[PDB]
């Protein structure tokens with residue numbers, strides 16, 4: 001799985017995924033399912049940002065924690081939008097809201113509720129994708145056009161297929177539960 005990850009995702013995503021694990025005291029070599037999952041989440045966040053008009057999104061995810069909070073703080077101080085209790089992934093300048101992005105091997109609605117109860121924010125928008133082509137977003141507002149979301153759905157399905165083809169998919173799907 002380690003070598004699958006390093007050949008499936010681009011080096012920039014891989015490097016950001018390694019840094020992110022280390023800061024939480026995780027070894028990518030050992031926790032390889034976590035490694036794949038972090039890379040997937042990052043790739044989705046970057047695809048999503050790319051789905052809007054050029055300036056639409058401020059990207060929060062992928063940054064160093066301290067700098068991430070600084071940017072969040074600048075958005076909050078300048079738009080009046082409420083400060084989130086946890087780091088979201090993007091800020092949407094068009095809709096004026098933070099967005100938390102999820103990618104789950106479980107049911108979209110389950111993960112959605114877990115994320116929503118954790119954040120406890122009326123303002124923040126939540127948008128969950130699965131590896132089975134499903135999505136669920138706050139108030140059924142999917143932010144992006146259908147073509148942009150469909151590209152993300154396709155990519156996740158290809159990741160699932162590439163994993164199953166190497167016998168890694170069962171382990172990956174189950175691992176989110178075991179956590």
Ligand SMILES: [Mn+2]
Nearest residue numbers: 061087088089
């Ligand atoms: Mn995040």
Ligand SMILES: [Mn+2]
Nearest residue numbers: 089100101102
């Ligand atoms: Mn997220």
